[PDB]
Amino acid sequence: GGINQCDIDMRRQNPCSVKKYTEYGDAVRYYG
Amino acid sequence: GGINQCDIDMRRQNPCSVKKYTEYGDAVRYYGR
Amino acid sequence: GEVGSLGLKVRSGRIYEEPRQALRFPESIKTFQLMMRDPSVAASVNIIKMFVRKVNWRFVPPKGKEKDAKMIERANFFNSLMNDMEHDWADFINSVMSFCTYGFCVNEKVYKKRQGKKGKYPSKYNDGLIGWAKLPIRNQTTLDKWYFDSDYRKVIGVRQNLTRKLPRSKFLLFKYDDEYGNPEGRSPLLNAYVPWKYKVQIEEFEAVGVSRDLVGMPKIGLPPDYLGEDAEPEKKAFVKYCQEVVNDLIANDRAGLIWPRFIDPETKEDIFEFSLVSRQGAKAYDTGSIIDRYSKQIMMAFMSDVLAMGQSKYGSFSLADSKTSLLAMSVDILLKQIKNVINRDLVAQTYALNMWDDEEHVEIVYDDIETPDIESIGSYVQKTVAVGAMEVDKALSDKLREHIGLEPADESKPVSENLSP
Amino acid sequence: NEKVYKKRQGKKGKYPSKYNDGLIGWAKLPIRNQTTLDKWYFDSDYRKVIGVRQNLTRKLPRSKFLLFKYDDEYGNPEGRSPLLNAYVPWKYKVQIEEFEAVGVSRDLVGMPKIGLPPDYLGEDAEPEKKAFVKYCQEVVNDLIANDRAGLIWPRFIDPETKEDIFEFSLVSRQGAKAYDTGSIIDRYSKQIMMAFMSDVLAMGQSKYGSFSLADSKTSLLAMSVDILLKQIKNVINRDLVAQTYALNMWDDEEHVEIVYDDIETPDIESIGSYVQKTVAVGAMEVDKALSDKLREHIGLEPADESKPVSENLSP
Cα–Cα distance, C401 to C388 (Å, whole number): 21
In sequence order, the β-bridge partners of residue C222 are D154
- Tally Cβ neighbours within 10 Å of residue D120: 16
Is the CB of residue A15 less than 8 Å away from at least one CB of chain C?
Answer: no
Q: What is the dihedral of CA A7, A12, A14, A17, to 10 degrees?
A: 120
Burial of A6-31, coded b for 16+ CB within 10 Å and e otherwise, reads: eebeebeeeeeeeeeeebbbeeeeee
- Tally Cβ neighbours within 10 Å of residue C181: 19
- Residues of B within 8 A of C201 (CB-CB) are 27-28
Amino acid identity of D254? E
Tell me which residue of C191, C192, C174 sits closest to C183, measured CA to CA. C174
Q: What are the backbone angles phi and psi of residue C242, rounded to the nearest 5°?
A: -60, -30
Compute the radius of gyration of chain B from its Cα atoms: 10
- Tally Cβ neighbours within 10 Å of residue D65: 22
Cis peptide leading into residue D308 (ω within 30°): no
The 3-class secondary structure across C111-141, one letter per residue, is EECCCCCCCCCCCCCCCCCCEECCCCCCCCC
Tell me which residue of D79, D95, D64, D86 sits closest to D34, measured CA to CA. D79
Cα–Cα distance, D15 to C227 (Å, whole number): 90
D51 and D66 Cβ atoms separated by less than 8 Å? no
C275 DSSP 8-state letter:
E
> What determination technique applies here?
cryo-EM
Cα–Cα distance, D212 to D226 (Å, whole number): 10
- Residues of D within 8 A of A24 (CB-CB) are 144, 146-148
Tell me which residue of C193, C196, C197, C185 sits closest to C17, measured CA to CA. C185
- Tally Cβ neighbours within 10 Å of residue D241: 15
D36 and D65 Cβ atoms separated by less than 8 Å? no
Residue B18 has its nearest CB partner, among A5, A27, A28, at A5
Amino acid identity of D217? K
- What kind and span of H or E run contains C149? none
DSSP string, C202-262: HHHHHHHHHHT--TT-EEEEE-TTTSSSSS-HHHHHHHHHHHHHHHH---STT--------
- Residues of D within 8 A of A20 (CB-CB) are 147
- Residues of A within 8 A of B16 (CB-CB) are 4-7
DSSP string, C256-267: -------B-TTT
DSSP string, chain D: -B-EEEE-TTS-SSS--S--S--EEEES-S---TTT---EE--TTTSS--EE---------GGGB----SS-SS--TT---GGGGGHHHHHHHHHHHHHHHHHHHT--TT-EEEE--GGGSSSSS-HHHHHHHHHHHHHHHH----TT--EEEE--B-TTTT-BSSEEEE-------SS-HHHHHHHHHHHHHHHTT-GGGTT---TT-BS-SSSTTB-HHHHHHHHHHHHHHHHHIIIIIHHHHHHTS---SS--------SS---HHHHHHHHHHHHTTSSSPP-HHHHHHHHHHHT--S--TTS---SSS--
Q: What is the dihedral of CA C349, C351, C357, C361, to 10 degrees?
A: -110
Q: What is the resolution of this structure in A?
A: 3.4
- What kind and span of H or E run contains C56? none
In sequence order, the β-bridge partners of residue C258 are none
C31 DSSP 8-state letter:
H
Is the CB of residue B26 less than 8 Å away from at least one CB of chain C?
Answer: yes
C41 DSSP 8-state letter:
H
Is the CB of residue A24 less than 8 Å away from at least one CB of chain D?
Answer: yes
Taking CA atoms, D94 is separated from D85, D100, D179, D192, in Å, by 16, 10, 16, 12
Q: Is D173 left (phi over 0), alpha (psi -120 to 50) or beta?
A: beta
C367 DSSP 8-state letter:
-
Cα–Cα distance, D135 to D120 (Å, whole number): 12
- Residues of A within 8 A of D148 (CB-CB) are 1-2, 8, 24
Cα–Cα distance, D42 to D54 (Å, whole number): 15
Cα–Cα distance, C330 to C99 (Å, whole number): 14
Cα–Cα distance, C60 to C367 (Å, whole number): 12
Cα–Cα distance, C259 to D279 (Å, whole number): 97
Tell me which residue of D156, D115, D166 sits closest to C272, measured CA to CA. D156
Tell me which residue of C215, C220, C214, C216 sits closest to C241, measured CA to CA. C220
Across the interface, whether the CB atoms of C211 and B20 are under 8 A apart is answered yes
In sequence order, the β-bridge partners of residue C171 are C108
Long-range contacts of C252-259 (CB under 8 A, 24+ apart): C252/A18
Contacts with C5 (C-beta within 8 Å, 6 or more apart), sequence order: C151, C152, C153, D54, D58
Cα–Cα distance, D54 to C4 (Å, whole number): 7
C319 and C332 Cβ atoms separated by less than 8 Å? yes
Give the side-chain half-sphere CA count within 13 A for C350: 25
Cα–Cα distance, D281 to D126 (Å, whole number): 108
C24 and C16 Cβ atoms separated by less than 8 Å? yes
Tell me which residue of C201, C185, C22, C200 sits closest to C101, measured CA to CA. C185
Cα–Cα distance, D302 to D294 (Å, whole number): 9
Across the interface, whether the CB atoms of D140 and B11 are under 8 A apart is answered no
C304 and D199 Cβ atoms separated by less than 8 Å? no
Taking CA atoms, D173 is separated from B8, C28, C279, in Å, by 27, 41, 9
Angle between helices C193-211 and D87-105 (to 10 degrees): 20
Contacts with A19 (C-beta within 8 Å, 6 or more apart), sequence order: none
D233 and D224 Cβ atoms separated by less than 8 Å? no
> Three-class SS of residue C90?
helix
Locate breaks in chain D with C to N over 2.5 A; list the residue preceding each: 55
Cα–Cα distance, D235 to C339 (Å, whole number): 27
Amino acid identity of D272? G
How many helices and strands in chain C, by DSSP H and E? 13, 10
Mutate which: C210, C217, C244, C253, vs A, most A CBs within 10 A: C244
Cα–Cα distance, D92 to D297 (Å, whole number): 46
Cis peptide leading into residue D30 (ω within 30°): yes
Give the side-chain half-sphere CA count within 13 A for C108: 15
- Residues of C within 8 A of D154 (CB-CB) are 221-224, 226-227
Report CA torsion sign: C374, C378, C384, C385. Answer: positive
Cα–Cα distance, D209 to D206 (Å, whole number): 6
Cα–Cα distance, C241 to C199 (Å, whole number): 45
C59 DSSP 8-state letter:
E
DSSP string, chain B: ----TTHHHHHTT-SSS---S--SS-TT-SS--
Cα–Cα distance, C123 to C86 (Å, whole number): 8
Mutate which: D137, D138, D141, vs B, most B CBs within 10 A: D141
Tell me which residue of D261, D270, D284, D297 sits closest to D216, measured CA to CA. D270
Long-range contacts of D301-304 (CB under 8 A, 24+ apart): D301/C395, D303/C391, D303/C392, D303/C393, D303/C395, D303/C396, D304/C393, D304/C394, D304/C395
Q: What are the backbone angles phi and psi of residue D24, rounded to the nearest 5°?
A: -75, 155
C71 and C331 Cβ atoms separated by less than 8 Å? no
Q: Is C125 left (phi over 0), alpha (psi -120 to 50) or beta?
A: left
Give the side-chain half-sphere CA count within 13 A for B19: 9
Is the CB of residue A11 less than 8 Å away from at least one CB of chain C?
Answer: yes
Tell me which residue of C195, C193, C202, C154 sits closest to C27, measured CA to CA. C193
- What kind and span of H or E run contains C108? strand C107-108
Tell me which residue of C308, C304, C328 sits closest to C316, measured CA to CA. C328
Q: What are the backbone angles phi and psi of residue D115, rounded to the nearest 5°?
A: -105, 110
Contacts with D269 (C-beta within 8 Å, 6 or more apart), sequence order: C376, C379, C380
Give the side-chain half-sphere CA count within 13 A for C285: 23
Cα–Cα distance, C331 to C52 (Å, whole number): 7
Taking CA atoms, C180 is separated from C177, C185, C281, C336, D30, in Å, by 9, 8, 53, 19, 11
Is the CB of residue B24 less than 8 Å away from at least one CB of chain C?
Answer: yes
Amino acid identity of C166? L
